[PDB]
Each structure stands twice: as C-alpha cells, then as structure tokens.
Amino acid sequence: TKAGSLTIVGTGIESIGQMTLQALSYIEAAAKVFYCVIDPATEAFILTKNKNCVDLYQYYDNGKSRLNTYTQMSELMVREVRKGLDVVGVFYGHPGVFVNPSHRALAIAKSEGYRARMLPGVSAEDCLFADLCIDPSNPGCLTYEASDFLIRDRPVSIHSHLVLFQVGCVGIADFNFTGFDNNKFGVLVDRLEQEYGAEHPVVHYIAAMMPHQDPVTDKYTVAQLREPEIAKRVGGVSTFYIPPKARKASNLDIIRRLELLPAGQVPDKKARIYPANQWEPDVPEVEPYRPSDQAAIAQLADHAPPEQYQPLATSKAMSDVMTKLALDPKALADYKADHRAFAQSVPDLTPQERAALELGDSWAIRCAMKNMPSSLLDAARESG
Amino acid sequence: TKAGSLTIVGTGIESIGQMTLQALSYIEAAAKVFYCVIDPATEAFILTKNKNCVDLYQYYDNGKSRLNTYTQMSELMVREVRKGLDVVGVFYGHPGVFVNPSHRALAIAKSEGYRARMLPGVSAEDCLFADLCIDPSNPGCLTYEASDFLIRDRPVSIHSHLVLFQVGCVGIADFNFTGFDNNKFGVLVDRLEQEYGAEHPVVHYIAAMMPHQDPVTDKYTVAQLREPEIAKRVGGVSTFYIPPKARKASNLDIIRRLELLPAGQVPDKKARIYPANQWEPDVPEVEPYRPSDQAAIAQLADHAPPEQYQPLATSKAMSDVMTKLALDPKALADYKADHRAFAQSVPDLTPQERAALELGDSWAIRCAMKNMPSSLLDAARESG
C-alpha cells in the first residue's frame, strides 16, 4: 500500500555476465539506481540500463571511517524510498555477502513499513567453488572474514573447507584510494601456521573480473605467505581457500541409527567419490571408471524414461506468461495485485493454464505445465 | 586446440530470473544442452533457447542408486564432448553446490584434454542469506550436508551461522518419484538438541521457486521438530538455518597485535552494528541512528567527490565491445584467439581503447574507461 520500495541486487563478480536476469530487470524498472561495483564495464552497462544512477563509491574517502561511508550509502537509498520512489541498490557479487549498507538500508526501509527485498547474486565464494572445482558439501565449508577470524578466534575444522574473505585488509578500519600495505597480514599467517602447519597449502584466489581473464589459483605453503614478494600479491579482491588436512571417520552410532549396515560395507574414511579435491595435500588418485561406473554406462543403451517421469507439456502462451512474470517486475506486481484479473487478460491460455494462474498455487502451475502419469498419482503423496 | 568443450552452468533457484546473463548466452551458443532443473517454467525457458536439449531428470528411477544416475548424467555430457561438440550442462542453483555429476563430468573432460569450465550460479544458500537477511561474514558460516553432518560428526560453532542442506533425505541412498518419508529425520533433531538445546530456534527455509511465491521462513524450536505435523513439512527443497546461541569475545593478543587500542574503546562483545540478526534468540534492539550515524548523514549536504575518485569516462564503442565480450561466447573465443586482430576489427574505438584491447591488460582497460586523476597517480601503488 505505502509508496516507495527498496530492492537490493547484485552484479556477480565477472563483468556483466554474472548479473542475474532479475537483477537486470529491476535495474531497468527502477526510478533511481545506486551502485557500488568494481569494474568499469559493469558500471558503463548499468548506466545504459537506467537514466538515474548514482555511484556510491564516491562516499569513500582517505582516512574516512568505512562505517560513516556505509551509513551515508544506506541513507542515500532510504531517502529516495521515503519520497515514494522504487529504488534499486546494486552491489557487486551477492549484495548481502560481506556488505554492511545493503542490510542497513533494507532493515531501515522494512522498519518504516516500506517494501524491502534483497535479490541474491553470485558471490566470490560461488566463483571460488566453480574455479577451484570444489563442492562445499564435500566435506563441509567454514567461511569467515579474515579480521573477525583472528579477533574472535573463530574455530577451524582441519576436516572441512576453510574460506577467508578480506585477507588484504587485516585490522584496517578506514579506506585509501590507492589501497593498503596490509602490514598486519603476518598475524593471519601465524594463526594459519598454528592451525595447519608451515607446509599446509593455502590457495590465493582471485576470480577473473573481465570475461577474457583467467582466475588466480596460486597454491602457496603457509610458510611462503611470509615471503615479502608473495605477501605483496594479496589485495582488496584476494580470497584464501585452505583445503582440509585429513578425512574424518564415520560415527558407528549414526551408521547404526541410519541403518547403513552392515558396517563393513561402509567405505574406508579414505574412500572418495570421483573426483578428489585436487588442492588437498597428498590426495590419492581416484578411479573415475570403476566396474560399477562401467555397468551404469552399459545400461544407457536400453534406457527409456521411467513410467513416473513427467514430460514437459506446456504451450507458448503459458511459457510466455511465466517468463514475463520472471523478467517484468511491473507484470509481476500486477499479477500479485489481482491473480484473477491478470490471468483473465493473458491471451491464448488454455482453460487449465488460466485456472492455474488464477489460483497461483505452485502445484496447479506444475501439472498445467507437466504431464503427470497415472503411475505417479496412484503413489503421489500430494493428498489430492 | 582439441575439438569439444564442456561448460556447466546454473539456473539459480527462483524460476528463470536467477539465471545469469552468461549462463543464458552459453545455453543459446551450445551444440547440445543437458539440464536438471526443478520447475517447469525454467525447463520451458531453456527449450526456447536451444533446439538440442536433453532432460537429465529421466535418468533417476525408483530404487535406482543415485550414484548410478550421476555416472549416467556425467557420461551423456562427456560422450558429446568427445564427439567434438560444445556441450552445456545446466543444473539448478549453483551447478557445483551439492551436485555430484557436474564435478565428475568436468574432471573427466579436463583429464582427457578438453576445455572444461564451471560458471557459478545463485545457490539455495545465496537465497537463504537474501531472504533471512543475514550476512555469512557476521558471525561466520558453517555449511554442511545433513547426512554428512551426522555420519562424520561435523563440528558446530554456537557463535556462527549453521546451514544444513538435504535435511529432507537423512540417510537415503536412492530415489523415489513421489519423494521420501524421511524416517531418520529424528537422528538429526537429536544432534541439534545436543548441540543447541530443545528451546533453540531452527529456521525451516524454502526459497520461492516461482516469481510470485513468498519464501518459507518458519522458525521452530529444536523440540517442535519432534511434532509429526512439523517433521512432515520438511521435503526435497528444505534447508535449515540455525542462528548463533552466543556472541564470542575478542582475543586480547590479537587486539594488541592489530593495534585496536586502547583496549577499553573495543566495543563490548554484545555490541552490534545495525542491524542485529532477527533470528538469534533474545537479540537486543540495536539503534540505527546513533549520534555518529546522524553526524555522518549531516555531512551529505556538503559532500563532493574526493579528488582521487575516478569518474567513468568511456564511449558507446568501448562499452558495446566489453558487453559483447561478456554476452557473446563466440566473440570472447575470437578475442581470446587473437587480441590484436579482434581489437583492430572493432568499429569506432579510440586509439587508447584499441590499444587497451590489443593488450588485454585489466589495468589498461580500466584507465581507458575511467579518468584517473593526477592526485591518484602521485600516490598510486601501481609501479608505472
């Protein structure tokens, strides 16, 4: 009901390409855009998409408290919300991952009764998983800010991934346009030596920011981080990845309670699903084509879709409107305001499609768009 | 040099809108697309973008080992790579976050000497940070697979965020088209009770998959997860978020070594930057407009861009080509093959812009596109 909204979106890390379709659509629809990005091609791209943009980067200054900058960035966005405008804030990466002013501005907007949403984006950690070919699932992931990691003595797990952000500004409160010497970097290295040992690998990660660039994926020992020529290479966009030191054994009580029995056919804790993490020290070679893999591949020749598989069975008119709801924030707002009026004005919908949109029920839309076999519904645990 | 490539991309979580621009451009450019998505509007959207798509979901079956499915999904993609095709695999969310077959297929392709890349996407955890209004930086984030969390007794930190994926299939090796009862869910709840207590909050999180839907952000006590009507609500797309129980004190040795002195003006460990995590039990009210905030806002009236601020100063021809390199994989491949030939064929570039593209140097492109003031370069720590 109340005039004015704040939507905060990300650009991702790599110039232009890592922006989501919805982030782009909200930037184009905004009355006013406030942005804080790293690369100028992304900045130029945003300025082609909206005629009313403000660069938040101008609110940093030499020796100026970053907290004061963040208060100012937030207040510029919320001032325009209070004037009844649809405001979009744009931060590089994911706009809520290691970002102060987005959370501040959204919480203020929400507290004063305005519509307030953050749209997720591709973070530097998302890029790290993609470029280092690791999965946070295997074997778990601990993510910290480097200064916080030290000051609050945050725990490490030698059995899980460790990711550290802001390793180029250890202990630094303010800002300098020409960056920081990072003179307290050795305090971080001392902690990594205590937790992992002088010979343990640390990966210096910098995601490519322009589309033609390669990422930096430079493995050093903890000891090598002490060499001035290497310490020197860590900057404002440097992240560290520290791989696990060991594999963790299975808990017999849980093996019993989850019925993963007999215990004997539970794989050795050293056993790995292909592929192995290439960054782990002394990682054993893992066979990609075990006899069981070869047997599974042999089954492809005779494969047919299972009877319970649900093939897509939609229409141009239905895919068109579902695309429009995802890519047109004005169409979405109209639909959310009156499902029935919106649904009855879409051309070329079948009766089922019209009915599914009128309801808005995620399950109604799903069998408007997918053939649910009788085989599935005789079993199906949707009580209907 | 070798014919054939594998690019694995994500769709993000929310239908269509959370796909990145580069993921879309690679899907359109592919010779063959293999996809595994959740919602049918995203499936229909992909099929409008490429004429040669295969649904990987048909390779699941009732009582069929998920490992065998994953081997088959991988092998379908790598078979087309080996035939010299540009193959794109598409997985929902981030295609490397809790995904077996992407890592498998990329490692096989890489090992056999083919071009192999994963493009990051928006994960369910990215959505969680956006929808629950939390930042993994504050106060650190531990992310685990629910079965792994139990079987390997992965550590919790009561002072950091905990995120658990695959809480709807605790201990389950196979597949069923109608989903799982999740009968071992109580083993997870027993662990959460041991680590956090019966009264500690757990957030049941389900990101909206269609653009009009609201996320599920349902707070329960650990105790309430024992009630059958609540346990019942946890499914294949359920994630849990467990907020911290306590704030961690500062380490005096690090306060001294980072020179955050005098120790006395270091804030109390209970002190919080606005806003506070709303999910933490007994979270104190935090003032958004402290006197220091009000003073920072008062400075906005007299603000001018600092002398070292670098305004964008580019051209339509340069923003056009940098956009084309991000959004046209064929243009990017051409440019990477011969910087000079590509650069000399771009119309309307200024000499500086042409020179910057010929080099490809990220810094050369940056001062082709930004006015670097003399103030910046008298200080600037780019040795040049």
């Binding site: 408290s65 970053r66 | 930086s137 980072l258 810094w363």
Partner: peptide, 14 residues
Amino acid sequence: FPWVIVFGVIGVIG
C-alpha cells in the same frame, strides 16, 4: 588493486 570493501567487523570499523 581494485579496493571495494563494503564490510568491516565490530572491533575494527567505527
């Protein structure tokens, strides 16, 4: 040597 730090921890920033 891009420097776009949009976060600081309690204890450091102020």
